Design a protein around this ligand. Structure first.
Ligand SMILES: NC(=O)c1ccc[n+]([C@@H]2O[C@H](COP(=O)([O-])OP(=O)(O)OC[C@H]3O[C@@H](n4cnc5c(N)ncnc54)[C@H](O)[C@@H]3O)[C@@H](O)[C@H]2O)c1
Ligand SMILES: NC(=O)c1ccc[n+]([C@@H]2O[C@H](COP(=O)([O-])OP(=O)(O)OC[C@H]3O[C@@H](n4cnc5c(N)ncnc54)[C@H](O)[C@@H]3O)[C@@H](O)[C@H]2O)c1
Lengths: 271, 271
Protein backbone atom coordinates (compact mmCIF):
# COMPACT_ATOMS: atom_id res chain seq x y z
CA UNK A 1 0.00 0.00 0.00
CA UNK A 2 2.84 2.41 0.78
CA UNK A 3 4.38 4.10 -2.24
CA UNK A 4 7.81 2.59 -1.46
CA UNK A 5 6.68 -0.71 0.02
CA UNK A 6 9.38 -3.32 -0.46
CA UNK A 7 11.87 -0.84 -1.93
CA UNK A 8 15.38 -0.53 -0.51
CA UNK A 9 17.57 2.52 -0.91
CA UNK A 10 20.56 4.54 0.24
CA UNK A 11 20.35 8.06 1.72
CA UNK A 12 23.54 10.13 1.62
CA UNK A 13 23.67 13.44 3.45
CA UNK A 14 21.92 13.22 6.82
CA UNK A 15 23.77 15.37 9.36
CA UNK A 16 20.99 16.07 11.88
CA UNK A 17 17.20 16.22 12.05
CA UNK A 18 17.18 19.52 10.12
CA UNK A 19 18.89 18.01 7.04
CA UNK A 20 16.94 17.90 3.79
CA UNK A 21 18.05 14.25 3.58
CA UNK A 22 16.36 13.59 6.91
CA UNK A 23 13.06 15.01 5.65
CA UNK A 24 13.43 12.71 2.66
CA UNK A 25 14.23 9.73 4.90
CA UNK A 26 11.19 10.29 7.11
CA UNK A 27 8.79 10.46 4.16
CA UNK A 28 10.34 7.42 2.46
CA UNK A 29 10.11 5.37 5.65
CA UNK A 30 6.47 6.37 6.14
CA UNK A 31 5.82 4.99 2.64
CA UNK A 32 7.37 1.62 3.51
CA UNK A 33 10.97 2.01 2.32
CA UNK A 34 13.84 0.08 3.86
CA UNK A 35 16.71 2.52 4.30
CA UNK A 36 20.48 2.64 4.56
CA UNK A 37 22.36 5.82 5.52
CA UNK A 38 25.86 7.16 5.15
CA UNK A 39 27.49 9.56 7.58
CA UNK A 40 30.56 11.77 7.32
CA UNK A 41 32.82 11.25 10.34
CA UNK A 42 32.48 9.47 13.67
CA UNK A 43 30.82 12.50 15.29
CA UNK A 44 27.98 12.59 12.75
CA UNK A 45 27.65 8.80 12.90
CA UNK A 46 26.61 9.09 16.54
CA UNK A 47 23.85 11.48 15.38
CA UNK A 48 22.80 9.50 12.31
CA UNK A 49 22.61 6.09 14.01
CA UNK A 50 19.73 7.04 16.36
CA UNK A 51 17.91 8.91 13.58
CA UNK A 52 18.16 5.83 11.37
CA UNK A 53 16.84 3.70 14.24
CA UNK A 54 13.81 6.00 14.54
CA UNK A 55 12.80 5.03 10.98
CA UNK A 56 13.57 1.33 11.45
CA UNK A 57 17.10 1.17 10.00
CA UNK A 58 20.29 -0.20 11.55
CA UNK A 59 22.20 -0.05 8.23
CA UNK A 60 24.48 2.97 8.73
CA UNK A 61 27.89 3.32 7.06
CA UNK A 62 30.75 5.84 7.12
CA UNK A 63 31.48 7.72 3.92
CA UNK A 64 33.56 10.74 2.89
CA UNK A 65 32.90 11.21 -0.82
CA UNK A 66 36.29 12.85 -1.25
CA UNK A 67 37.87 9.48 -0.28
CA UNK A 68 36.70 7.14 -3.03
CA UNK A 69 37.75 4.05 -1.03
CA UNK A 70 35.03 4.81 1.54
CA UNK A 71 32.48 5.08 -1.29
CA UNK A 72 33.57 1.74 -2.77
CA UNK A 73 33.19 0.21 0.69
CA UNK A 74 29.63 1.56 1.07
CA UNK A 75 28.45 -0.11 -2.13
CA UNK A 76 30.34 -3.30 -1.29
CA UNK A 77 28.40 -3.51 1.97
CA UNK A 78 25.12 -2.80 0.18
CA UNK A 79 25.86 -5.65 -2.24
CA UNK A 80 26.76 -7.97 0.66
CA UNK A 81 23.59 -7.24 2.65
CA UNK A 82 20.93 -6.47 0.03
CA UNK A 83 22.46 -7.64 -3.26
CA UNK A 84 20.74 -4.77 -5.02
CA UNK A 85 19.41 -1.26 -4.78
CA UNK A 86 16.08 0.29 -5.71
CA UNK A 87 16.98 3.94 -5.16
CA UNK A 88 19.68 6.38 -4.11
CA UNK A 89 19.44 9.89 -2.65
CA UNK A 90 22.46 12.22 -2.99
CA UNK A 91 22.04 15.23 -0.68
CA UNK A 92 25.66 16.26 -0.23
CA UNK A 93 27.38 19.57 -0.83
CA UNK A 94 30.32 21.60 0.37
CA UNK A 95 32.29 24.75 -0.34
CA UNK A 96 34.68 26.85 1.73
CA UNK A 97 32.37 29.25 3.59
CA UNK A 98 34.88 32.07 3.12
CA UNK A 99 34.12 31.96 -0.62
CA UNK A 100 30.33 32.10 -0.06
CA UNK A 101 30.42 35.82 0.72
CA UNK A 102 31.56 38.79 -1.33
CA UNK A 103 31.55 38.71 -5.12
CA UNK A 104 32.25 35.40 -6.89
CA UNK A 105 34.99 37.09 -8.89
CA UNK A 106 36.77 38.48 -5.84
CA UNK A 107 36.79 35.51 -3.46
CA UNK A 108 36.90 32.31 -5.50
CA UNK A 109 40.12 30.27 -5.64
CA UNK A 110 41.07 27.30 -7.82
CA UNK A 111 41.67 25.11 -4.75
CA UNK A 112 38.14 25.70 -3.45
CA UNK A 113 36.68 25.44 -6.94
CA UNK A 114 38.15 22.00 -7.54
CA UNK A 115 37.25 20.65 -4.08
CA UNK A 116 33.72 22.06 -4.32
CA UNK A 117 33.33 20.49 -7.77
CA UNK A 118 34.40 17.05 -6.51
CA UNK A 119 32.26 17.01 -3.37
CA UNK A 120 29.15 18.87 -4.61
CA UNK A 121 29.01 17.60 -8.21
CA UNK A 122 31.32 14.75 -9.25
CA UNK A 123 30.45 12.65 -6.17
CA UNK A 124 26.98 12.36 -7.72
CA UNK A 125 28.46 10.78 -10.85
CA UNK A 126 30.61 8.49 -8.70
CA UNK A 127 27.73 7.17 -6.60
CA UNK A 128 25.47 6.89 -9.68
CA UNK A 129 28.16 4.81 -11.42
CA UNK A 130 28.25 2.46 -8.44
CA UNK A 131 24.48 2.35 -7.93
CA UNK A 132 23.97 1.35 -11.58
CA UNK A 133 25.71 -1.99 -11.01
CA UNK A 134 23.17 -2.76 -8.26
CA UNK A 135 20.05 -1.65 -10.17
CA UNK A 136 19.77 -4.50 -12.69
CA UNK A 137 15.95 -4.27 -12.55
CA UNK A 138 15.79 -0.48 -12.86
CA UNK A 139 15.80 2.10 -10.13
CA UNK A 140 15.58 5.78 -9.35
CA UNK A 141 18.43 8.15 -8.45
CA UNK A 142 17.88 11.63 -7.00
CA UNK A 143 20.11 14.60 -6.15
CA UNK A 144 19.37 18.00 -4.60
CA UNK A 145 20.15 21.26 -6.38
CA UNK A 146 19.34 24.97 -6.07
CA UNK A 147 18.26 27.67 -8.53
CA UNK A 148 21.54 29.58 -8.12
CA UNK A 149 22.76 27.28 -10.90
CA UNK A 150 20.86 29.21 -13.57
CA UNK A 151 20.07 32.61 -12.01
CA UNK A 152 22.60 34.54 -10.00
CA UNK A 153 22.05 34.70 -6.23
CA UNK A 154 24.24 36.89 -3.96
CA UNK A 155 26.85 34.93 -1.99
CA UNK A 156 25.97 31.57 -3.58
CA UNK A 157 29.03 32.13 -5.81
CA UNK A 158 30.95 28.96 -6.70
CA UNK A 159 28.16 26.75 -5.33
CA UNK A 160 26.04 28.09 -8.20
CA UNK A 161 28.70 26.93 -10.64
CA UNK A 162 28.86 23.53 -8.92
CA UNK A 163 25.07 23.14 -9.07
CA UNK A 164 25.08 23.98 -12.78
CA UNK A 165 27.55 21.16 -13.32
CA UNK A 166 25.47 18.86 -11.13
CA UNK A 167 22.35 19.56 -13.21
CA UNK A 168 24.21 18.73 -16.42
CA UNK A 169 25.28 15.46 -14.80
CA UNK A 170 21.62 14.71 -14.06
CA UNK A 171 20.93 15.09 -17.78
CA UNK A 172 23.85 13.03 -19.10
CA UNK A 173 23.29 10.27 -16.53
CA UNK A 174 19.58 10.14 -17.34
CA UNK A 175 20.33 9.78 -21.04
CA UNK A 176 22.89 7.03 -20.25
CA UNK A 177 20.79 4.98 -17.84
CA UNK A 178 17.28 5.53 -19.22
CA UNK A 179 17.46 2.54 -21.57
CA UNK A 180 18.13 0.21 -18.60
CA UNK A 181 15.15 1.65 -16.71
CA UNK A 182 17.14 3.75 -14.25
CA UNK A 183 15.67 7.24 -13.82
CA UNK A 184 17.89 10.16 -12.73
CA UNK A 185 16.37 13.42 -11.46
CA UNK A 186 17.04 16.40 -9.21
CA UNK A 187 14.92 18.44 -6.83
CA UNK A 188 15.76 22.13 -6.99
CA UNK A 189 14.72 23.02 -3.46
CA UNK A 190 13.90 26.46 -2.21
CA UNK A 191 15.84 27.71 0.80
CA UNK A 192 14.93 25.75 3.91
CA UNK A 193 15.06 26.93 7.51
CA UNK A 194 13.82 24.59 10.22
CA UNK A 195 14.86 27.16 12.82
CA UNK A 196 12.51 30.05 13.59
CA UNK A 197 12.76 33.41 11.86
CA UNK A 198 14.86 34.30 8.83
CA UNK A 199 18.22 34.23 10.65
CA UNK A 200 21.19 36.62 10.85
CA UNK A 201 23.40 38.71 8.56
CA UNK A 202 23.43 38.57 4.77
CA UNK A 203 21.76 35.16 4.86
CA UNK A 204 18.73 36.57 6.67
CA UNK A 205 18.19 39.23 4.00
CA UNK A 206 18.51 36.66 1.19
CA UNK A 207 16.26 34.12 2.91
CA UNK A 208 13.53 36.58 3.90
CA UNK A 209 13.38 37.92 0.35
CA UNK A 210 12.56 34.44 -0.94
CA UNK A 211 10.02 33.92 1.84
CA UNK A 212 8.21 37.22 1.17
CA UNK A 213 8.24 37.03 -2.60
CA UNK A 214 7.66 33.37 -3.49
CA UNK A 215 4.17 32.71 -4.88
CA UNK A 216 3.24 30.48 -1.91
CA UNK A 217 4.50 33.20 0.50
CA UNK A 218 6.37 30.56 2.48
CA UNK A 219 9.64 28.69 2.16
CA UNK A 220 9.45 24.95 1.68
CA UNK A 221 10.26 22.71 4.61
CA UNK A 222 11.97 19.36 4.73
CA UNK A 223 8.60 17.57 4.56
CA UNK A 224 7.74 19.35 1.28
CA UNK A 225 11.13 18.26 -0.08
CA UNK A 226 10.68 14.74 1.28
CA UNK A 227 7.24 14.30 -0.29
CA UNK A 228 8.57 15.40 -3.66
CA UNK A 229 11.46 12.97 -3.18
CA UNK A 230 8.95 10.17 -2.54
CA UNK A 231 7.30 11.04 -5.86
CA UNK A 232 10.54 10.99 -7.87
CA UNK A 233 11.85 7.80 -6.19
CA UNK A 234 8.53 5.92 -6.46
CA UNK A 235 6.68 4.41 -9.41
CA UNK A 236 4.44 7.50 -9.43
CA UNK A 237 7.15 9.21 -11.52
CA UNK A 238 7.66 6.27 -13.90
CA UNK A 239 7.56 8.66 -16.87
CA UNK A 240 10.02 11.21 -15.43
CA UNK A 241 13.77 11.30 -15.95
CA UNK A 242 16.41 13.98 -16.45
CA UNK A 243 14.15 16.51 -14.75
CA UNK A 244 15.27 19.47 -12.64
CA UNK A 245 12.10 19.62 -10.53
CA UNK A 246 11.57 22.89 -8.64
CA UNK A 247 10.22 22.48 -5.10
CA UNK A 248 10.62 26.11 -4.13
CA UNK A 249 7.11 27.54 -3.59
CA UNK A 250 7.18 28.86 -7.16
CA UNK A 251 10.03 31.30 -6.45
CA UNK A 252 11.83 30.49 -9.70
CA UNK A 253 8.93 31.76 -11.84
CA UNK A 254 8.89 35.37 -10.62
CA UNK A 255 11.00 38.25 -11.84
CA UNK A 256 10.33 40.84 -9.16
CA UNK A 257 9.17 41.19 -5.56
CA UNK A 258 5.56 42.07 -4.70
CA UNK A 259 4.18 45.40 -5.85
CA UNK A 260 4.19 46.67 -2.25
CA UNK A 261 7.91 45.89 -1.97
CA UNK A 262 8.68 47.36 -5.42
CA UNK A 263 7.11 50.63 -4.31
CA UNK A 264 8.83 50.78 -0.92
CA UNK A 265 12.23 50.01 -2.48
CA UNK A 266 11.57 52.57 -5.23
CA UNK A 267 10.91 55.29 -2.67
CA UNK A 268 13.77 54.18 -0.40
CA UNK A 269 16.48 53.71 -3.01
CA UNK A 270 15.38 55.95 -5.87
CA UNK A 271 15.73 55.85 -9.64
CA UNK B 1 -4.64 6.26 3.01
CA UNK B 2 -5.41 7.30 -0.56
CA UNK B 3 -3.52 10.42 -1.58
CA UNK B 4 -6.78 12.13 -2.61
CA UNK B 5 -9.08 10.84 0.14
CA UNK B 6 -11.91 13.27 0.82
CA UNK B 7 -11.00 15.47 -2.17
CA UNK B 8 -13.45 16.52 -4.89
CA UNK B 9 -12.47 17.78 -8.29
CA UNK B 10 -13.47 18.47 -11.87
CA UNK B 11 -11.94 16.81 -14.93
CA UNK B 12 -12.39 18.55 -18.28
CA UNK B 13 -11.35 16.76 -21.45
CA UNK B 14 -12.33 13.08 -21.39
CA UNK B 15 -13.26 11.96 -24.90
CA UNK B 16 -12.79 8.18 -24.69
CA UNK B 17 -10.79 5.56 -22.79
CA UNK B 18 -7.51 6.68 -24.43
CA UNK B 19 -7.72 10.34 -23.35
CA UNK B 20 -5.03 11.72 -21.05
CA UNK B 21 -7.90 13.05 -18.92
CA UNK B 22 -9.18 9.50 -18.52
CA UNK B 23 -5.85 8.15 -17.30
CA UNK B 24 -5.75 11.06 -14.86
CA UNK B 25 -9.31 10.25 -13.74
CA UNK B 26 -8.52 6.57 -13.11
CA UNK B 27 -5.45 7.33 -10.99
CA UNK B 28 -7.26 10.01 -8.97
CA UNK B 29 -10.21 7.69 -8.36
CA UNK B 30 -7.84 4.94 -7.21
CA UNK B 31 -6.44 7.40 -4.66
CA UNK B 32 -9.93 8.12 -3.33
CA UNK B 33 -10.97 11.26 -5.22
CA UNK B 34 -14.61 12.11 -5.88
CA UNK B 35 -14.90 13.19 -9.51
CA UNK B 36 -16.99 15.38 -11.79
CA UNK B 37 -16.60 15.37 -15.59
CA UNK B 38 -17.41 17.56 -18.56
CA UNK B 39 -17.83 16.43 -22.15
CA UNK B 40 -17.83 18.33 -25.43
CA UNK B 41 -20.77 17.68 -27.71
CA UNK B 42 -23.97 15.70 -27.44
CA UNK B 43 -22.49 12.58 -29.05
CA UNK B 44 -19.74 12.36 -26.42
CA UNK B 45 -22.20 12.15 -23.53
CA UNK B 46 -22.79 8.45 -24.22
CA UNK B 47 -19.03 7.78 -24.24
CA UNK B 48 -18.01 9.78 -21.15
CA UNK B 49 -20.96 8.77 -18.94
CA UNK B 50 -20.11 5.02 -18.86
CA UNK B 51 -16.45 5.84 -18.25
CA UNK B 52 -17.34 8.08 -15.31
CA UNK B 53 -19.55 5.26 -14.01
CA UNK B 54 -16.48 2.98 -13.85
CA UNK B 55 -14.95 5.32 -11.26
CA UNK B 56 -18.19 5.78 -9.30
CA UNK B 57 -19.35 9.09 -10.77
CA UNK B 58 -22.53 10.25 -12.48
CA UNK B 59 -21.70 13.96 -12.04
CA UNK B 60 -21.23 14.47 -15.80
CA UNK B 61 -22.09 17.72 -17.58
CA UNK B 62 -21.88 19.06 -21.15
CA UNK B 63 -19.40 21.86 -21.72
CA UNK B 64 -17.94 23.57 -24.78
CA UNK B 65 -15.36 26.04 -23.49
CA UNK B 66 -15.88 28.23 -26.54
CA UNK B 67 -19.43 28.88 -25.25
CA UNK B 68 -18.82 30.52 -21.89
CA UNK B 69 -22.47 30.08 -20.86
CA UNK B 70 -21.94 26.31 -20.69
CA UNK B 71 -18.83 26.80 -18.52
CA UNK B 72 -20.75 29.04 -16.12
CA UNK B 73 -23.45 26.37 -15.94
CA UNK B 74 -20.89 23.72 -14.99
CA UNK B 75 -19.46 25.78 -12.14
CA UNK B 76 -22.93 26.82 -10.97
CA UNK B 77 -23.80 23.12 -10.71
CA UNK B 78 -20.60 22.37 -8.78
CA UNK B 79 -21.38 25.18 -6.35
CA UNK B 80 -24.88 23.82 -5.75
CA UNK B 81 -23.96 20.14 -5.41
CA UNK B 82 -20.57 20.41 -3.68
CA UNK B 83 -20.17 24.04 -2.59
CA UNK B 84 -16.45 23.85 -3.24
CA UNK B 85 -13.63 22.35 -5.27
CA UNK B 86 -10.34 20.79 -4.23
CA UNK B 87 -8.80 20.45 -7.69
CA UNK B 88 -9.37 21.05 -11.39
CA UNK B 89 -7.89 19.26 -14.42
CA UNK B 90 -7.86 21.10 -17.77
CA UNK B 91 -7.16 18.61 -20.59
CA UNK B 92 -8.55 20.47 -23.58
CA UNK B 93 -6.85 21.31 -26.85
CA UNK B 94 -8.03 22.00 -30.38
CA UNK B 95 -6.80 23.30 -33.70
CA UNK B 96 -8.00 22.97 -37.29
CA UNK B 97 -6.21 19.81 -38.47
CA UNK B 98 -5.56 21.35 -41.91
CA UNK B 99 -3.15 23.76 -40.20
CA UNK B 100 -1.25 20.93 -38.44
CA UNK B 101 0.30 19.74 -41.71
CA UNK B 102 2.79 21.70 -43.78
CA UNK B 103 4.90 24.64 -42.68
CA UNK B 104 3.50 26.81 -39.89
CA UNK B 105 4.09 29.89 -42.06
CA UNK B 106 2.34 28.41 -45.09
CA UNK B 107 -0.85 27.03 -43.52
CA UNK B 108 -1.77 29.10 -40.45
CA UNK B 109 -4.68 31.54 -40.66
CA UNK B 110 -5.82 34.22 -38.24
CA UNK B 111 -9.22 32.56 -37.83
CA UNK B 112 -7.66 29.29 -36.71
CA UNK B 113 -5.06 31.11 -34.61
CA UNK B 114 -7.69 32.94 -32.60
CA UNK B 115 -9.96 29.92 -32.13
CA UNK B 116 -7.00 27.70 -31.18
CA UNK B 117 -5.85 30.30 -28.63
CA UNK B 118 -9.28 30.54 -26.99
CA UNK B 119 -9.92 26.80 -26.77
CA UNK B 120 -6.38 25.56 -26.10
CA UNK B 121 -5.06 28.37 -23.92
CA UNK B 122 -7.49 31.02 -22.70
CA UNK B 123 -10.10 28.47 -21.56
CA UNK B 124 -7.55 27.46 -18.91
CA UNK B 125 -7.56 31.00 -17.53
CA UNK B 126 -11.36 31.01 -17.67
CA UNK B 127 -11.78 27.81 -15.68
CA UNK B 128 -9.04 28.82 -13.25
CA UNK B 129 -10.86 32.11 -12.65
CA UNK B 130 -14.04 30.20 -11.83
CA UNK B 131 -12.24 27.52 -9.80
CA UNK B 132 -10.65 30.18 -7.59
CA UNK B 133 -14.03 31.28 -6.22
CA UNK B 134 -14.68 27.67 -5.13
CA UNK B 135 -11.25 27.06 -3.57
CA UNK B 136 -11.58 29.15 -0.40
CA UNK B 137 -9.17 26.95 1.59
CA UNK B 138 -6.71 26.30 -1.24
CA UNK B 139 -6.55 23.76 -4.01
CA UNK B 140 -4.58 22.56 -6.99
CA UNK B 141 -5.12 23.32 -10.70
CA UNK B 142 -3.51 21.36 -13.52
CA UNK B 143 -3.29 21.67 -17.31
CA UNK B 144 -1.53 19.60 -19.97
CA UNK B 145 1.05 20.99 -22.40
CA UNK B 146 3.63 19.63 -24.84
CA UNK B 147 7.27 20.44 -25.47
CA UNK B 148 6.49 21.91 -28.89
CA UNK B 149 5.91 25.12 -26.92
CA UNK B 150 9.64 25.76 -26.51
CA UNK B 151 11.31 23.54 -29.17
CA UNK B 152 10.03 23.32 -32.72
CA UNK B 153 8.34 20.13 -33.87
CA UNK B 154 7.30 19.66 -37.52
CA UNK B 155 3.56 20.13 -38.16
CA UNK B 156 2.78 21.02 -34.52
CA UNK B 157 2.62 24.60 -35.86
CA UNK B 158 0.10 26.90 -34.13
CA UNK B 159 -0.50 24.33 -31.37
CA UNK B 160 3.07 25.03 -30.30
CA UNK B 161 2.30 28.75 -30.17
CA UNK B 162 -0.84 28.01 -28.13
CA UNK B 163 1.06 25.78 -25.70
CA UNK B 164 3.66 28.54 -25.21
CA UNK B 165 0.84 30.88 -24.24
CA UNK B 166 -0.71 28.24 -21.99
CA UNK B 167 2.58 27.78 -20.11
CA UNK B 168 2.85 31.53 -19.53
CA UNK B 169 -0.69 31.43 -18.11
CA UNK B 170 0.40 28.69 -15.70
CA UNK B 171 3.12 31.02 -14.40
CA UNK B 172 0.97 34.16 -14.15
CA UNK B 173 -1.91 32.27 -12.50
CA UNK B 174 0.49 30.56 -10.07
CA UNK B 175 1.88 33.96 -9.08
CA UNK B 176 -1.65 35.39 -8.64
CA UNK B 177 -3.18 32.50 -6.70
CA UNK B 178 -0.20 31.25 -4.67
CA UNK B 179 -0.78 33.58 -1.70
CA UNK B 180 -4.23 32.05 -1.15
CA UNK B 181 -2.91 28.50 -1.24
CA UNK B 182 -3.99 27.59 -4.78
CA UNK B 183 -1.22 25.85 -6.73
CA UNK B 184 -1.19 25.95 -10.53
CA UNK B 185 0.96 23.60 -12.63
CA UNK B 186 1.23 21.81 -15.96
CA UNK B 187 2.38 18.40 -17.11
CA UNK B 188 4.31 18.50 -20.37
CA UNK B 189 3.47 14.99 -21.53
CA UNK B 190 5.22 12.85 -24.07
CA UNK B 191 3.23 11.74 -27.11
CA UNK B 192 0.17 9.50 -26.67
CA UNK B 193 -1.99 8.00 -29.44
CA UNK B 194 -5.21 9.91 -28.68
CA UNK B 195 -7.93 11.31 -30.90
CA UNK B 196 -6.39 14.78 -30.74
CA UNK B 197 -2.92 13.26 -31.03
CA UNK B 198 -3.66 11.82 -34.45
CA UNK B 199 -4.61 15.26 -35.83
CA UNK B 200 -1.01 16.15 -36.66
CA UNK B 201 0.31 15.33 -40.11
CA UNK B 202 2.75 12.40 -40.26
CA UNK B 203 1.83 11.52 -36.69
CA UNK B 204 3.43 8.08 -37.01
CA UNK B 205 6.93 9.33 -37.87
CA UNK B 206 6.82 12.07 -35.25
CA UNK B 207 5.63 9.61 -32.58
CA UNK B 208 8.14 6.87 -33.38
CA UNK B 209 11.02 9.35 -33.26
CA UNK B 210 10.19 10.05 -29.63
CA UNK B 211 9.75 6.33 -28.92
CA UNK B 212 13.15 5.39 -30.32
CA UNK B 213 15.11 8.34 -28.99
CA UNK B 214 13.70 9.18 -25.54
CA UNK B 215 16.01 8.14 -22.66
CA UNK B 216 13.43 5.65 -21.37
CA UNK B 217 13.05 4.25 -24.95
CA UNK B 218 9.27 4.23 -24.57
CA UNK B 219 6.55 6.83 -24.82
CA UNK B 220 4.50 7.54 -21.72
CA UNK B 221 1.02 6.13 -21.34
CA UNK B 222 -2.02 7.69 -19.72
CA UNK B 223 -1.13 5.88 -16.46
CA UNK B 224 2.29 7.57 -16.31
CA UNK B 225 0.57 10.91 -16.89
CA UNK B 226 -2.22 10.11 -14.43
CA UNK B 227 0.20 9.22 -11.64
CA UNK B 228 2.10 12.47 -12.15
CA UNK B 229 -1.25 14.28 -12.03
CA UNK B 230 -1.97 12.58 -8.69
CA UNK B 231 1.33 14.00 -7.47
CA UNK B 232 0.63 17.58 -8.61
CA UNK B 233 -2.99 17.57 -7.44
CA UNK B 234 -2.23 15.96 -4.07
CA UNK B 235 -0.56 17.22 -0.90
CA UNK B 236 2.65 15.46 -1.97
CA UNK B 237 3.38 18.51 -4.15
CA UNK B 238 2.62 21.11 -1.46
CA UNK B 239 5.87 22.89 -2.29
CA UNK B 240 5.31 23.01 -6.08
CA UNK B 241 3.61 25.72 -8.13
CA UNK B 242 4.12 27.41 -11.48
CA UNK B 243 5.91 24.29 -12.68
CA UNK B 244 6.00 22.98 -16.25
CA UNK B 245 6.66 19.37 -15.24
CA UNK B 246 7.98 17.08 -17.99
CA UNK B 247 6.51 13.57 -18.01
CA UNK B 248 7.99 12.65 -21.37
CA UNK B 249 10.46 9.79 -20.79
CA UNK B 250 13.26 12.38 -20.62
CA UNK B 251 12.86 13.32 -24.28
CA UNK B 252 13.23 17.07 -23.65
CA UNK B 253 16.81 16.65 -22.33
CA UNK B 254 18.36 15.15 -25.48
CA UNK B 255 19.67 17.00 -28.50
CA UNK B 256 20.00 14.13 -30.96
CA UNK B 257 18.72 10.65 -31.73
CA UNK B 258 20.68 7.62 -30.51
CA UNK B 259 24.17 7.06 -31.89
CA UNK B 260 22.87 4.05 -33.86
CA UNK B 261 20.19 6.23 -35.48
CA UNK B 262 22.66 9.08 -36.09
CA UNK B 263 24.91 6.73 -38.05
CA UNK B 264 22.11 5.20 -40.09
CA UNK B 265 20.77 8.66 -41.01
CA UNK B 266 24.30 9.85 -41.82
CA UNK B 267 24.78 6.95 -44.22
CA UNK B 268 21.31 7.24 -45.76
CA UNK B 269 21.07 11.02 -46.08
CA UNK B 270 24.68 12.20 -46.30
CA UNK B 271 26.54 15.36 -45.34
N1 LIG C 1 19.60 23.99 2.87
C1 LIG C 1 18.94 24.53 1.85
O1 LIG C 1 18.22 25.54 1.98
C2 LIG C 1 19.11 23.91 0.49
C3 LIG C 1 18.37 24.37 -0.59
C4 LIG C 1 18.49 23.76 -1.82
C5 LIG C 1 19.36 22.71 -1.97
N2 LIG C 1 20.08 22.28 -0.91
C6 LIG C 1 21.08 21.11 -1.07
O2 LIG C 1 20.63 20.03 -0.28
C7 LIG C 1 21.77 19.23 0.10
C8 LIG C 1 21.72 18.94 1.58
O3 LIG C 1 22.07 20.12 2.33
P1 LIG C 1 21.26 20.52 3.64
O4 LIG C 1 20.67 21.87 3.46
O5 LIG C 1 20.38 19.39 3.99
O6 LIG C 1 22.43 20.61 4.73
P2 LIG C 1 23.21 19.52 5.60
O7 LIG C 1 24.38 20.15 6.27
O8 LIG C 1 22.24 18.91 6.62
O9 LIG C 1 23.55 18.38 4.50
C9 LIG C 1 24.76 18.36 3.72
C10 LIG C 1 25.38 17.00 3.91
O10 LIG C 1 26.55 16.85 3.07
C11 LIG C 1 27.47 16.09 3.81
N3 LIG C 1 28.80 16.21 3.23
C12 LIG C 1 29.55 17.34 3.03
N4 LIG C 1 30.77 17.11 2.60
C13 LIG C 1 30.82 15.73 2.51
C14 LIG C 1 31.86 14.84 2.14
N5 LIG C 1 33.09 15.23 1.79
N6 LIG C 1 31.59 13.52 2.16
C15 LIG C 1 30.37 13.12 2.53
N7 LIG C 1 29.32 13.86 2.91
C16 LIG C 1 29.62 15.16 2.88
C17 LIG C 1 27.34 16.60 5.23
O11 LIG C 1 27.90 15.69 6.18
C18 LIG C 1 25.82 16.69 5.35
O12 LIG C 1 25.29 15.45 5.78
C19 LIG C 1 23.02 19.99 -0.38
O13 LIG C 1 23.51 19.44 -1.59
C20 LIG C 1 22.49 21.41 -0.60
O14 LIG C 1 23.23 22.09 -1.60
C21 LIG C 1 19.97 22.85 0.30
N1 LIG D 1 -1.78 13.22 -27.06
C1 LIG D 1 -0.57 13.72 -26.86
O1 LIG D 1 0.43 13.27 -27.43
C2 LIG D 1 -0.44 14.94 -26.01
C3 LIG D 1 0.82 15.28 -25.52
C4 LIG D 1 0.96 16.32 -24.63
C5 LIG D 1 -0.14 17.04 -24.26
N2 LIG D 1 -1.35 16.72 -24.75
C6 LIG D 1 -2.56 17.56 -24.38
O2 LIG D 1 -3.43 16.77 -23.61
C7 LIG D 1 -4.76 17.35 -23.71
C8 LIG D 1 -5.77 16.26 -23.95
O3 LIG D 1 -5.63 15.76 -25.30
P1 LIG D 1 -5.54 14.20 -25.57
O4 LIG D 1 -4.25 13.87 -26.21
O5 LIG D 1 -5.94 13.46 -24.35
O6 LIG D 1 -6.66 13.99 -26.69
P2 LIG D 1 -8.24 13.74 -26.64
O7 LIG D 1 -8.77 13.78 -28.03
O8 LIG D 1 -8.57 12.46 -25.87
O9 LIG D 1 -8.67 14.97 -25.71
C9 LIG D 1 -8.79 16.32 -26.17
C10 LIG D 1 -10.05 16.83 -25.52
O10 LIG D 1 -10.26 18.23 -25.84
C11 LIG D 1 -11.66 18.39 -25.88
N3 LIG D 1 -12.01 19.67 -26.48
C12 LIG D 1 -11.64 20.17 -27.70
N4 LIG D 1 -12.24 21.30 -28.02
C13 LIG D 1 -13.06 21.55 -26.93
C14 LIG D 1 -13.98 22.57 -26.66
N5 LIG D 1 -14.28 23.56 -27.52
N6 LIG D 1 -14.64 22.53 -25.48
C15 LIG D 1 -14.39 21.52 -24.64
N7 LIG D 1 -13.55 20.49 -24.80
C16 LIG D 1 -12.92 20.56 -25.97
C17 LIG D 1 -12.16 17.18 -26.63
O11 LIG D 1 -13.55 16.97 -26.43
C18 LIG D 1 -11.33 16.09 -25.94
O12 LIG D 1 -12.04 15.58 -24.82
C19 LIG D 1 -4.67 18.43 -24.80
O13 LIG D 1 -4.46 19.71 -24.22
C20 LIG D 1 -3.40 18.03 -25.55
O14 LIG D 1 -2.78 19.13 -26.21
C21 LIG D 1 -1.53 15.69 -25.60
Amino acid sequence: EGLMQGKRGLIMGVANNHSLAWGIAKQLAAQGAELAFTYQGDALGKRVKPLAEQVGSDFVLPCDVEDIATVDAVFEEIEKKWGGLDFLVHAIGFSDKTELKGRYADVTTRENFSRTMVISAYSFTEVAQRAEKLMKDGGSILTLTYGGSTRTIPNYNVMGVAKAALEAMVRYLAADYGPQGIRVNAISAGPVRTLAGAGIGDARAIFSYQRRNSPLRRTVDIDDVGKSAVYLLSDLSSGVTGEIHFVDSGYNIVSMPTLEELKSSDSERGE
